Amino acid sequence: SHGLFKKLGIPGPTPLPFLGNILSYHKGFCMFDMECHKKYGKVWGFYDGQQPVLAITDPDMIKTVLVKECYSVFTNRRPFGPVGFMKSAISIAEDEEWKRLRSLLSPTFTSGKLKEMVPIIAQYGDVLVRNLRREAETGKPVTLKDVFGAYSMDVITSTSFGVNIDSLNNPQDPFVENTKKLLRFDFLDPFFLSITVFPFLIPILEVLNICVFPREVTNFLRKSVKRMKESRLEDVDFLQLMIDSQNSKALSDLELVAQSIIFIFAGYETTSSVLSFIMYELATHPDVQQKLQEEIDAVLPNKAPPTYDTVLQMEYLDMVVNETLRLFPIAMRLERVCKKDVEINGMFIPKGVVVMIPSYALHRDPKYWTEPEKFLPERFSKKNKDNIDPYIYTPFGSGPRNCIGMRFALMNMKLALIRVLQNFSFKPCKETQIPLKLSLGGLLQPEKPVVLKVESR
Amino acid sequence: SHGLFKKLGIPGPTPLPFLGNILSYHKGFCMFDMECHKKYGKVWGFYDGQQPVLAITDPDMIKTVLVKECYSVFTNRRPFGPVGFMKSAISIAEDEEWKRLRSLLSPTFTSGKLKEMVPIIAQYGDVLVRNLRREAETGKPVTLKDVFGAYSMDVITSTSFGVNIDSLNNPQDPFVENTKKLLRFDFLDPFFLSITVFPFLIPILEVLNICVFPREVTNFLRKSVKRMKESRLEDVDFLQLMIDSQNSKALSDLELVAQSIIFIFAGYETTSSVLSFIMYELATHPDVQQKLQEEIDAVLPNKAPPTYDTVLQMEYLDMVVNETLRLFPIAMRLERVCKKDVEINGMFIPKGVVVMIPSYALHRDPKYWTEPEKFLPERFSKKNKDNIDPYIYTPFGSGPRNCIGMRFALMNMKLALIRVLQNFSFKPCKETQIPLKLSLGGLLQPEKPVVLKVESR
Amino acid sequence: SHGLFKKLGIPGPTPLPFLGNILSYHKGFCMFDMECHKKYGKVWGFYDGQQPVLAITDPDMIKTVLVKECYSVFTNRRPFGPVGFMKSAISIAEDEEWKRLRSLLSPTFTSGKLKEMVPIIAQYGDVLVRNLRREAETGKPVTLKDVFGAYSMDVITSTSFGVNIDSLNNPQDPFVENTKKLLRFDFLDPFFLSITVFPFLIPILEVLNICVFPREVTNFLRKSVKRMKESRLEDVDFLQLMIDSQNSKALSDLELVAQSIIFIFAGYETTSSVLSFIMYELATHPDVQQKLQEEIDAVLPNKAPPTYDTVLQMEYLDMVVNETLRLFPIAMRLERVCKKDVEINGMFIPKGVVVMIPSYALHRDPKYWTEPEKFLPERFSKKNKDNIDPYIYTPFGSGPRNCIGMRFALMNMKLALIRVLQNFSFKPCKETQIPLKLSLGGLLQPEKPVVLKVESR
Amino acid sequence: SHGLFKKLGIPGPTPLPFLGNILSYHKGFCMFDMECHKKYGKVWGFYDGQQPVLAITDPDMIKTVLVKECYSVFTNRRPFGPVGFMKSAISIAEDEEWKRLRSLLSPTFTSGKLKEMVPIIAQYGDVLVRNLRREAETGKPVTLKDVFGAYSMDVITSTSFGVNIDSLNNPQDPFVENTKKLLRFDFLDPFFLSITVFPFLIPILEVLNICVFPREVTNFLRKSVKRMKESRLEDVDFLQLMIDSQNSKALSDLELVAQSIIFIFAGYETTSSVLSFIMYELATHPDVQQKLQEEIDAVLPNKAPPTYDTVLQMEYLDMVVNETLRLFPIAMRLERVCKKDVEINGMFIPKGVVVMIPSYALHRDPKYWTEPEKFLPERFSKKNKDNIDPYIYTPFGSGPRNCIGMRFALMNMKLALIRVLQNFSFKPCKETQIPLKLSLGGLLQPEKPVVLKVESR
Numbered sequence A, B, C, D: 001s002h003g004l005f006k007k008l009g010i011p012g013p014t015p016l017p018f019l020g021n022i023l024s025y026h027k028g029f030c031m032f033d034m035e036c037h038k039k040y041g042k043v044w045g046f047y048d049g050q051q052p053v054l055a056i057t058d059p060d061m062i063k064t065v066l067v068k069e070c071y072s073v074f075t076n077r078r079p080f081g082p083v084g085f086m087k088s089a090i091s092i093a094e095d096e097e098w099k100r101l102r103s104l105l106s107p108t109f110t111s112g113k114l115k116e117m118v119p120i121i122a123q124y125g126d127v128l129v130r131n132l133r134r135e136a137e138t139g140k141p142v143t144l145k146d147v148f149g150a151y152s153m154d155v156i157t158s159t160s161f162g163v164n165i166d167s168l169n170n171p172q173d174p175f176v177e178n179t180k181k182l183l184r185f186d187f188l189d190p191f192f193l194s195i196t197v198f199p200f201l202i203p204i205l206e207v208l209n210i211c212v213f214p215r216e217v218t219n220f221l222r223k224s225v226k227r228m229k230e231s232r233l234e235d236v237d238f239l240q241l242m243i244d245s246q247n248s249k250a251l252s253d254l255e256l257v258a259q260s261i262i263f264i265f266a267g268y269e270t271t272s273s274v275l276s277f278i279m280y281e282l283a284t285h286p287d288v289q290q291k292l293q294e295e296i297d298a299v300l301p302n303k304a305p306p307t308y309d310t311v312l313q314m315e316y317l318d319m320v321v322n323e324t325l326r327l328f329p330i331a332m333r334l335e336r337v338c339k340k341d342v343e344i345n346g347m348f349i350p351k352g353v354v355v356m357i358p359s360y361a362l363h364r365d366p367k368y369w370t371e372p373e374k375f376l377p378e379r380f381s382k383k384n385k386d387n388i389d390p391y392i393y394t395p396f397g398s399g400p401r402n403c404i405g406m407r408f409a410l411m412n413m414k415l416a417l418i419r420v421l422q423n424f425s426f427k428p429c430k431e432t433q434i435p436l437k438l439s440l441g442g443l444l445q446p447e448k449p450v451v452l453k454v455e456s457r
């Protein structure tokens, strides 16, 4: 099985027996990917165990994979481990169950439904401020991922189930506890590496009701939901929206529980981690932070409360957000299984091959980005934003399987940043890691957690 | 997983934990199936481990499965174990590789190509006679499966590769040895039962290059073929026909080796075992045997050599053959995986369910057959043959995945039977098992091997 | 493998393929064991999967197993699953690592060291009272396992590491949280039953650093200990005692962490569950409760604080405790692997066979106990205590591998019961389950949790 | 687990994750071992998967392992795969079953019993001659392993069961066929390498009655023996000797079948392969061959038939044999599992570590052997034989677990060589591989099979 790329005249690094090239993940996906791109060119291959994975960096080729032949050929992502009933979550589901599921949950994420969610996310914007000011009034360096974790959790709890907790001060609410265990997967920790070497063991685990989702969190929420379900039934949030949907092919109950869980998992560490990357960049580029605080005050004078419309109004805000995702695209890669022997843009792809787009590397490619490591929001000026290829810059992926939660993720984050910058300024501490070193692990996240000083305006 | 049939209001026997109903295979597939049909009605379910298997006996419903929605829904059979490169044999291949493969091998089985193969199969008809007469001249009771095994092997060797061995007298020819190990699979022996309980182990075995096809036989033939291939290339048989085919999507070389192997496996014990069932029936119904010997002598007077055309000429011959397959349909069941949630003839079939047609039981069903256990060829008289439902009587299955080798199997067998009955008469011995008890195992085959007395006409 | 007992002329129930007799655990170990004893006699066998397990109820035979040939033949218990570094905990360790470990931890459990621990366990006796009175003053039915759980945890935290938490009011102390997850193992839950059917999977799990001890609790305590270790080093409890021991074959650090963990696991739900069984019995036998409260007040007048010496002073106290363990011997069984072909008291035991003593059943055997189901403490009167066979009554097992923590467990429990009965009386509620039904699961524990009314004296 | 040798300050090559150093077996055990010895010194370690294996080359240390603490510590060899009932063969059995089994089979291999076997092995010496002369009279280059295979098989068949076949001319005798499949194990073929990486899969295989001994050969012999057993019972060979032994702790029947099988496996390819190595050396050192033919003719004039006593009479014969085993010690390594934490000759060996003696390398060590690659029988002259350390030269191992079949193996081989050299001379062909390259695989055997010219004296 290790001769496939050698036969198709595709270049790449040499796979050791059983391991493939996984030993080369010792500097993380990102670094490996950047190195590979440099050595091998526009396309290359490698092996995750016996799994062949082919990399591609041609925007046209990418578009065909992610848009054109999405339905016919490149419809699903790669399996990664045992999942139990979470087999039915949309980000995991495959082919027709997916298309079906994608349909039942899309109206939930309209610009319409989203404009309705704005006042709630706004209320926890406030709760954030109060908590921050408590630390700002006690001149003690702040850990963002905490305060932001607390926030991002606060907004999920309230927008998916309408449970309204100040998780930062109520860390020990059972509803807060279980949900905090739903953290992004380290695909380079002991366990998943083994799965990569012995995927033949995945079935043995499924048959043991072992799941990568801790059996206790899921069981907590399954019943939590079936309570909420039958407390609102009968007597505005994602659950409501999903309960309304199965009031017609219609969403099953366990299906409904599954999605709910994934929304938490999806929004939680991601909204948290991204907000952290942005405060780091703002504090190490004080000019940008000033330019922002002034735009914010112009649209929203007297520290006016942001709205759905005043948010899309702000352009330097969108630029700062976008540039950050360029430097830190927390998905790192996009991936699709090739379900048929196909030929796309002149290249034969055999079946079962996993096709991969190395986002991190591309967002940091000198051939598309002047001074790529530098933090320069002006790349996204309405003057230069046009020059940017949508299939090189893909922080939310692209095509029928792009991030369903993108509009929501972007607003969530911006509503926070405004209210925060309306009130404080963020200054580097001595214990602040400048320049931020990235984790050599399997998540896009800082080597050392970001600590900053905060001051009241 | 064991609640599926209970939910769909389908009846059946209660599955024990992990085993399902496999413990009920202690009297073999056939008996279990007959019992089930009687208890539970027109449709029922059971579990091979965790695998749900639904039985169906409505001819309409059957037709939809085997013909109508063959391509869309019910395209493949159930996996059964580790297969290695034999993954590419047609009877094993799935979906598009299958349709493709089915296409490249069909012209090989035309009435045209078959009429060309007749003189070769005829030559080993002769070799059979000589061997039989040696035993007939030495009044020693004969074991058919041997003499017939020897024959059926002789015809394969010669029709697939043109190697011409008298295997009965050359039992120790390397080409004869390897090929005799390709015997039908006992799906109720220790090994396959475990596979049924731990299908999650199948992948562990594949990854150990362990295959249910002994790694030595296959390796013998792979190279045997790549010799023949390059001895004829360059300087009438199935190999020729397949080599000509890849002289164009065209048949690969290892693909070609795979099919060759399956043709042997397919034709060998089957042509042998069926010919045995027929001699048993003939000898325990001496009237039928006389009626046959007289028809044979009328079409072919002076013991004239049968031809392609004189063979299709013989009608009592076809009746005797057909009735035998009714009583002994060596496939026992037909099976299809349900690849989508579907509804056929008013019944909801969830995905992944294996759908099954219990041939043996149906061929022995009193509601379609008067005195079913009795051996009465007149059921297939051109007068009554019309009254027989093609979707109740299915010894070669039906629809796009029916037995590719049916015409060939039927002629093979008839060419033998004529030449044999032209010369001898077969009389029961005292050591003959009357009435023939069927094996309680996982193959349709006699409990005790068939021994008969043979006399020269 | 399933023919072993059939060959040795030992009776028992018939094992199904792969499962053995595990299907007969549907009414729990206890019931199965009681039934078996009745049907089959003094000795019998059955199969946990392919594992042969032989039961024995002859006190002599038992003594040989648990005492005489302990070292030579019956030294270890049966493996049960993947354990990681907890392979080194004493209750799990085998043979020479065990004997060694047993030696390094025994001085920790002297009558000497124990008399020193009495004032600390006394302080949380007090904390218990206050908490109870809060519920007693608010006439709301009380759940014992909670209040007692809280207590039993309080005493462990303080006696193993000197951390002093009121866990009932501090439920959300990180030290309290992790440790509450160390609960007795349900050997009849989905997971362990599978392990019993596929013990061949245990090694696959070990090789995945999966452990039946949640990898987070253990990792919390490993470092927690290595802090305490290096905070006391340098600047009375089990840790001290173990740190002093490795200040010499001497206790390693990870070895030390392992034992610490097992002491928690051991003492926690056990001290809790037993105290619960006793309050149930006391409240459904009000006479006994009065007789006790009067003995307590005689030794300790003016609600005097109990001491080590006033505790061993109390005889009706010991009787009540003992009788409870008769009815509820929370270990249920004792077990030893037979490491050699041996013959003990006239019976040939082949190697690898697990030998078992069915405590629950024996403690409830009419041939040794008049009215066994009845609760009658007088069985243990210094007059009748003599008539009781130590190898029929074994709540703490017996011999070199008996419960290392017995003296400590007994004092712990009695110190609680005195202080509690000194202050309140416990009366059945309407929601109280009379008579207590036992869990049909794999732990000795009540079907419904015990709720009682509590009143201030 | 990969840090063990690093901790004990033992040197060696760096293990990759999961594989250990197995990738370094690409030039075979022998080469790896020679390289290691050179780099790392007198002792070193490496990992076969996760299995630590420590090498040792100090003769004293070796003696302690193989003799002194054999019983107490280093009693068994390493498991290698699934074995089924062959678990009971002596070379596989462990600890007390071994000691027992070793005792019941030792009297079978006395100098006494051996002197009785000499005339039978002599008769097939003759059959060899006739076959050789047929090739010698038809000047066609000869393949030794064949003719010798044929011989070595002939002598086993006759000495273990008294079945008397000329296997070279009867290649197709069922008794000859099955037994020829019992060939030495390639511990570097796909299968065993996987076992080395996933030893956790060995139990899954055992539970599938899969055995590294083909289930058909063993089943053939099991019944073959139980026939012979009951044909001689009732109405001189190893079977007789074992049947007599169980006529007394006494040999069971399946136990008996197991040993019989191992004797075949043991003697077959080994006697064959060694005889081949010797003819190669003789023909590439024509001087030695002449010196031998003259000694042979002196003890046995007029081509007199060798006897037990005339065989031990011949000293250049013993020298030639011995030197060959120096250059080609077909066991390659000796191995013992360390069953306890021990310290031997100043070195701490933790438990479970496999201890290894690299025979091949040591026999070719310049520090003990002048011109080691050269073939010089005079090393074993009764003058220099004294200077040779028995714990450096170990072709049959040493100590309580040395080759049980050594006396027999040596006589077998010498009886052949005499009768052969009495009649022919062996001259290199052009197609002869000079100098013989060794297989880079996992058996000591020539890269290309040895072909020589043979001439009649």
Ligand code: HEM
Pocket: A090, A091, A092, A102, A262, A263, A266, A267, A268, A270, A271, A274, A325, A329, A330, A331, A334, A335, A394, A395, A396, A397, A398, A399, A400, A401, A402, A403, A404, A405, A406, A408, A409
């Ligand atoms: C900063 C925040 C986020 C970023 C940068 C991000 C990025 C991504 C990316 C790159 C993908 C894969 C797209 C592809 O495969 O082409 C994805 C998938 C997905 N995201 Fe997000 N995402 C974010 C937040 C969220 C949030 C808040 C939700 C809330 C539900 C969400 C729900 C999903 C779902 C359901 C998928 C898989 C869609 C499918 O398979 O049909 N994401 N995201």
Ligand code: HEM
Pocket: B090, B091, B092, B102, B262, B263, B266, B267, B268, B270, B271, B274, B325, B329, B330, B331, B334, B335, B394, B395, B396, B397, B398, B399, B400, B401, B402, B403, B404, B405, B406, B408, B409
């Ligand atoms: C007495 C002889 C035979 C009988 C009674 C018989 C019967 C059957 C039956 C019932 C099936 C399954 C049909 C279905 O799934 O609906 C089958 C499949 C098949 N048979 Fe035969 N068969 C015979 C001989 C042969 C021979 C001689 C060949 C020679 C190549 C052959 C080749 C095949 C193949 C390739 C399949 C699977 C077809 C596919 O999956 O595309 N069979 N046979």
Ligand code: HEM
Pocket: C090, C091, C092, C102, C262, C263, C266, C267, C268, C270, C271, C274, C325, C329, C330, C331, C334, C335, C394, C395, C396, C397, C398, C399, C400, C401, C402, C403, C404, C405, C406, C408, C409
């Ligand atoms: C009500 C409380 C308890 C009861 C009824 C109880 C009973 C038992 C029983 C029956 C055994 C098995 C004995 C055998 O195999 O023969 C045992 C083992 C053991 N118990 Fe307890 N036990 C209790 C509490 C404790 C406590 C508080 C500790 C504190 C450390 C403890 C530590 C242990 C250990 C370490 C073993 C295994 C000993 C060894 O394998 O060397 N137990 N217990």
Ligand code: HEM
Pocket: D090, D091, D092, D102, D262, D263, D266, D267, D268, D270, D271, D274, D325, D329, D330, D331, D334, D335, D394, D395, D396, D397, D398, D399, D400, D401, D402, D403, D404, D405, D406, D408, D409
């Ligand atoms: C040229 C022929 C042979 C050579 C060079 C040879 C060499 C060896 C070696 C080096 C060992 C391992 C010794 C150790 O572990 O220290 C061994 C083991 C063994 N050999 Fe041989 N051997 C030969 C032939 C035979 C024959 C003909 C038999 C006939 C039965 C035999 C039976 C055994 C047995 C049973 C063992 C394992 C002994 C035990 O584990 O108790 N060997 N041999």
Ligand SMILES: CC(C)(C)OC(=O)NCCSC[C@H](NC1CCCC1)C(=O)NCc1cccnc1
Pocket: B077, B091, B092, B262, B265, B266, B267, B270, B330, B331, B332, B333, B334, B335, B403
């Ligand atoms: C439906 C089931 C599972 C209950 O039973 C059967 O499969 N019966 C056997 C006949 S269909 C398929 C059969 N296996 C081939 C695919 C797997 C390996 C070879 C076969 O076709 N083998 C060659 C063959 C056999 C008999 C008739 N024709 C061809």
